[model samples]
Target: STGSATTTPIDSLDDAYITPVQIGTPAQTLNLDFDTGSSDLWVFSSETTASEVDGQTIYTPSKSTTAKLLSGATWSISYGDGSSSSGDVYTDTVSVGGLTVTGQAVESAKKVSSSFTEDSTIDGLLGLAFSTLNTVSPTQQKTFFDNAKASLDSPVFTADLGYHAPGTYNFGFIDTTAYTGSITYTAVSTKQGFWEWTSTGYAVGSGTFKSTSIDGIADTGTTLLYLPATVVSAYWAQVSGAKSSSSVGGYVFPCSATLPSFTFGVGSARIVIPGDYIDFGPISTGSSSCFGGIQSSAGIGINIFGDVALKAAFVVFNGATTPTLGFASK
Candidate 1:
């Protein structure tokens, strides 16, 4: 069996990608952020605090005959930026695109952070990372991909994120027409419950490639590319007015500065990110200084190849005994 769904950026900055998901018996469709960095299929629901609810859609399990409470089951998740959500669990028929997963754990949010309440574009998050990372207590739950992998033609899912355009998430099989070249497979370490891998190296603009080993996770939940301070500094130094701004909280440069492209290695294959992609957007509504799409991972503890990097290539999350990641130019 296979399934395919279209995902679109939530805002002009491509802050996050949201995909529609069908939950419960009568199909309560809600737009969810398909996050590859975490593992927990949580949603805004009727159980959530009414005061916390904004214009976002909510899933009412009471309306679905197929829904059943998972007694004693509870879940709570906190992100790096301090955003968090916690809720009770329910098992129900959930569908993505044309794929169905019976008795899928549908976590209904009882409480949510202000950031989530304010973002009306997304109702919740669908975590694609390993099930081992699930925050459910007593009984951990499998992700939609994990539950559907066995019946799928192949135990894999691919992410094709776009730069302002709509992209796709394909389950079960790879779309041969989506990419331009043979995929380069690399070993993945699931010990951390993330799609973590080692990058060969990187280059600034048209400069020569730097041969080094950089370990990072492929996180769709994050918005920017985070690397070592050395690498980030080197890239920003090339820009005439780029500087690490304390007020802006990261690196910012002149809006009209001539930006340079960034290139990263996957085995012998090199993926080039256009300069425009690096010049994220202005720091403020009418500010002349623009924030950079790439930043230092110093305090983050680990580098993150977020949407800024993922949008540059086609990423495959293979779910095998010894999982591997595949990358290809799109």
Candidate 2:
């Protein structure tokens, strides 16, 4: 999805499913990114429609009486892969994990790309990682974590893995109650985006990839877990009988056979992508290569560990305490 996030859901599209997430008060529901790198809270403003996109969902403010419009404030963002979207600043009621916030800055862009749109039934993105980049006001940083930093119940955490089923594949919240469990704390010491610490990398199959290095920002707001060209090549190389292919918007390797027990070290935790999400469709160029879960992107900044990656673990962002990161089991 080029990190823009979501493909929208036609079914189970209810406000109750989103609950009232918060930014300041009277929380509004927002789609949160279980990102491992960057941090931000953005949504698809209500002022969007079909004409503005190419096979993508549209956000309408009327859907939620709480939606707001930051009129005249326009912005356009491009990821490392050069995929981009542009819109204006609008305000609205947004929620995440049952909490709602009023008068929040909603990215009511007229145009949106990525599977997050055509394949989605929801709104925009909500980045949960820590970073200095702000999609709205690049120099101002994010307000979601910045505002919710204090009211947090304590040792806040999130669980991803939307299951990609027909149900809800977006949004997650820290049960605060789970805070009593074991937690491992890590500081947010990366550069601008989320893919700062590139020490530990993962592979899906028996590819010769030693590991994936950083090429883009790891963001929760993003949907598919993206990788660099090198990593993508290496992963597809390993899957048993994996053939170079294209589909799902990137080079892929398709192997109908049961894959290996792929695992990798992220700081301390071990992650394993479910076997079902292994193939990224077929190669678009009508090639014979198979695709691994990891797809390639022509990106900027470092590598990003978006939803597909973040969903594999319990993520925590400390914008107030230390602007740090930590991972635990769900």
What is the per-residue lDDT of model 2 for residues 1-330, given as tens digits with 9 covering 90 to 100? 001122232332111112123332333444433333434454554455565444333445555566555545666665543445667765665545444445656566666666446534344555455545566653344445444444555434444334443222222234444333455555555455453444356655543325543434446455555666766666656566765433355544444555453444455555666655554443445655544555565443345565556555555554444455555554
Off by over 4 Å in 2: 1-46, 53-72, 113-120, 129-131, 137-141, 155-157, 165-183, 201-217, 222-234, 243-251, 282-290, 296-301
RMSD of each: 0.7, 6.7
Q: What lDDT does each candidate get?
A: 0.94, 0.48
Clashes of 1: 0
lDDT of residue 124 for candidate 2? 53
Clashing pairs in 1: none
Candidate 1 yields a Cα-based lDDT of: 0.94
lDDT of 1 by residue, 1-330 (tens): 999999999989899999999998899999999999999999999999999999999999999999999999999999877899999999999888899999999999999999999999999999999999999999899999999989899999999999988899999999999999888989999989999999999999999999999999999999999999999999999999899988889999999998999999898888888888887888999999999999999999899999999999999999988999999988
Q: What's the lDDT for candidate 2?
A: 0.48
* TM-score against truth, every candidate: 0.99, 0.66
